[PDB]
Design a protein around this ligand. Structure first.
Ligand code: HEM
Ligand code: HEM
Ligand code: H4B
Ligand code: H4B
Ligand code: K9C
Ligand code: K9C
Ligand code: ZN
Lengths: 421, 413
């Protein structure tokens, strides 16, 4: 943690001065001699050990988060702060863990969002609906909570940010997990010839669902069932009611033939495979949802080679020279696809933000955070959109990345580490 | 140790051992990554010899002569010069080896599959700015080759006491002038406004156009720099037209064929070559995305979108994205039509992956800066976007150095 670091924007010459990085807790993966900025998962530095930690292992982390929370609310040292510490101490003394007050849970979830270096949408961080689901005991009850989340968050197209927080990890053998990587995704099917139908990213998860009894309709856009694990038990399949799943058919403002590709996407991005860490407590099931940046769909989902991979089909209908890469036929089609995605969501009054608007807002959010907080951890490799990078303002914005707690973390896919009953 | 890097598109995993042999810092720490920072933060006799020994060891190892009689005598010979003169002189072979490996080690360069085909011009006997001009003219002519571009570097005398540096004051050998108008607008290239003012102050008579090739401002032996006009017949340029849009040529755009960076420092075995201009050939996006469409550069998006009849009222029409593509189509089409070497960002990044994979197999790794390697448009449709990379500093190296007008103490009263 160097004493005070500046970042420069090379377009506007604005300089920001970072001191928040002094509060960084765990390693980035980098050293003075090697930078891992482009490694997807550079580090295994965790704040607590494997499972049920000893008291001297968990209490220091609790003490820090409680300190931080009461600091945030103009106390620190107050009666309630000192009482809370003694309370957490006794709780760990008798259960090896402790339970967050509702206020602390809301604070923790919002600050995990605020601390998410890879999220360009964090100007919204304090406007987050928190659903406390820590009283949940079964997969049916998990399904009820998620249906309510999806319905509230979708809001007939006027999307609202939300998170639903299921019971925290205890001994590691009673984990709550949503096995889906997102609440809503499309199935992928290995074809007899060798090609893939639907979303290739989801082939493995789709096979698990089939193996568990799901009856695949075997189309290009089959909404996957939920596969929900409560209290360490075997996970259970649930079909989200289709009236809860808002979808947008993709058409083009100028290309009438575009609709005949039969593309669609879903409206609600809802990451459900990550882990929420607050004061040493691990929430292994914590689906959170926002609204899409158009490029997530139009660039990555649709045009990645190992995803829907639609560039050649679109370029054909556009009558483009596909003989050689230097005609930039991929680049031309890409732009049209992302025009259609934005046009479609906007036509149906489903919240979406383009990459120009999203990145501009993030520059403003960065400036706010340096003004009030003294910094904003940001992952350039993830913030910069996957098309037209340098004509967005974040391309020319230097960023500092560091890990602050509360945080959202990655965790292994539950099928790699689950003993079936 | 070992370190794995993964490609998330192909699932190929490579194992880096080369990183164990790096020395200067990256700027990152164990708790902060400064991977997106542009510039993160003379040697004594004692400092010099470990650096020299390191380089001589790796040179003789590279040619399968480590421990040899020639290796050991060279080490002793270098040691004598450092003792005697406080510096030493590279053999021609070492100079060529060192220049190729600084290119090979340039983590920000996507074109390194070409690293070992580098024409090295040894200009360590130069003494005056006139001689510098002669060397640079020859470099331009050789490199340009009537459009069949050849990679080359010209290496001027190394730093001695820091009071006698050789410097090219230009940031590239060929760039276009910029003039700020009283009304606040800029004619030509806004990036070059300050350097254009310096040239005008030194005596240059500007034509005051949109694409005036700047003069060379060359500094020999720490003396004041001097102006030279490159012979116009040596500056190959390409007027930009579009394969489908007849009106595109009416924008009056052109660009030069030879990218030749001239403000960096070449460090070989502790020796510092402060004047070392090097050239290759363009990747199209350098011109069509950054040079033409950076808000701070020629900034032609609105003009091009206008002529495309695009709805420029809302951002979500993606009019800028649409105009950006066509401009980059025109750049590539124009160079190819005029048979001037260029590479498009898809071909360039595919080759880099092949190179990177090859370098892990034969060398144990390939330092690479994802922030610079990924092209400034269409990022994720190029393979490098999905490629994990490790960044670390190997020497020989190209480094940044301060602009000379910030450090030079003028002699001319
Ligand atoms: C409200 C509108 C939001 C927008 C426009 C937005 C935008 C984005 C985008 C574009 C990404 C990169 C997606 C990818 O390439 O995989 C991302 C990642 C992420 N977002 Fe946000 N986000 C929003 C809301 C939220 C909320 C409510 C949370 C949590 C409470 C959140 C937390 C995260 C995290 C942790 C990541 C990293 C995911 C990963 O590492 O795979 N975001 N966001
Ligand atoms: C042969 C064709 C070559 C291609 C296609 C190529 C490609 C590129 C590109 C696209 C960049 C980024 C430029 C920018 O964004 O400002 C770059 C940077 C760089 N190239 Fe290469 N290059 C080539 C040859 C060379 C040669 C011959 C050398 C040295 C002898 C070299 C050394 C470098 C260095 C040091 C940088 C970093 C410059 C900086 O940090 O500003 N390249 N190259
Ligand atoms: C290897 C590289 O880090 C990887 O492809 C990253 C790059 N940047 C990204 N940025 C976003 N938003 N999402 C991603 O999945 C990735 N992938
Ligand atoms: C702030 C950021 O590091 C800066 O804009 C970088 C990003 N990547 C780049 N990549 C290339 N090739 N050239 C550049 O000038 C830059 N600029
Ligand atoms: C692989 N990550 C997929 C994703 C995502 C995502 C998540 C959220 C909360 C918002 C958004 N706009 N996108
Ligand atoms: C500010 N860097 C400008 C540049 C550059 C460059 C340099 C070389 C040798 C090749 C190339 N294709 N591009
Ligand atoms: Zn780093």
């Amino acid at each position: 943690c160097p004493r005070f670091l500046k970042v420069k924007n090379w377009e506007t010459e604005v300089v920001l001065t970072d001191t928040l990085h002094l509060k960084s807790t765990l390693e980035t993966g980098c050293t003075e001699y090697i930078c891992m900025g482009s490694i997807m998962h550079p580090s295994q530095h965790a704040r607590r050990p494997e499972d049920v930690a000893t008291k001297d292992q968990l209490f220091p982390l609790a003490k820090e988060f409680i300190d931080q929370y009461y600091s945030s609310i103009k106390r620190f040292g107050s009666k309630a702060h000192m009482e809370r510490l003694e309370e957490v101490n006794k709780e760990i003394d008798t259960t090896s863990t402790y339970q967050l007050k509702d206020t602390e849970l809301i604070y923790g979830a919002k600050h995990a969002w605020r601390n998410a270096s890879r999220c360009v949408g964090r100007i919204q961080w304090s406007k987050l609906q928190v659903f406390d689901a820590r009283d949940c005991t079964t997969a049916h009850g998990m399904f009820n909570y998620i249906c309510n989340h999806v319905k509230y968050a979708t809001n007939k197209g006027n999307l609202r940010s939300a998170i639903t927080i299921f019971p925290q990890r205890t001994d590691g053998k009673h984990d709550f997990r949503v096995w889906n990587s997102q609440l809503i995704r499309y199935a992928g099917y290995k074809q007899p010839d060798g090609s893939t139908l639907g979303d290739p990213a989801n082939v493995q998860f789709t096979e698990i669902c089939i193996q568990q009894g799901w009856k695949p309709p075997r189309g290009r856009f089959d909404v996957l069932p939920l596969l929900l694990q409560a209290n360490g038990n075997d996970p259970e399949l649930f079909q989200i009611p289709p009236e809860l799943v808002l979808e947008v058919p993709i058409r083009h403002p100028k290309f009438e033939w575009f609709k005949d590709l039969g593309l669609k996407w879903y409206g609600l991005p809802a990451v459900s495979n990550m882990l929420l860490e607050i004061g040493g407590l691990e929430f292994s099931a914590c689906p959170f949802s926002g609204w899409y940046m158009g490029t997530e769909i139009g660039v990555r989902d649709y045009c990645d080679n190992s995803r829907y991979n639609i560039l050649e089909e679109v370029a054909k209908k556009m009558n483009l020279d596909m003989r050689k890469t230097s005609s930039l036929w991929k680049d031309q089609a890409l732009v049209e696809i992302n025009i259609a995605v934005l046009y479609s969501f906007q036509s149906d009054k489903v919240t979406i933000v383009d990459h120009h608007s999203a990145t501009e807002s993030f520059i403003k959010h960065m400036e706010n955070e340096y003004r009030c907080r003294g910094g904003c951890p940001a992952d350039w490799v993830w913030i910069v959109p996957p098309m037209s990078g340098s004509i967005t303002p974040v391309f020319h914005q230097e960023m500092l990345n560091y890990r602050l707690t509360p945080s959202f973390e990655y965790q292994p896919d539950p099928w790699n580490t689950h003993v079936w009953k």
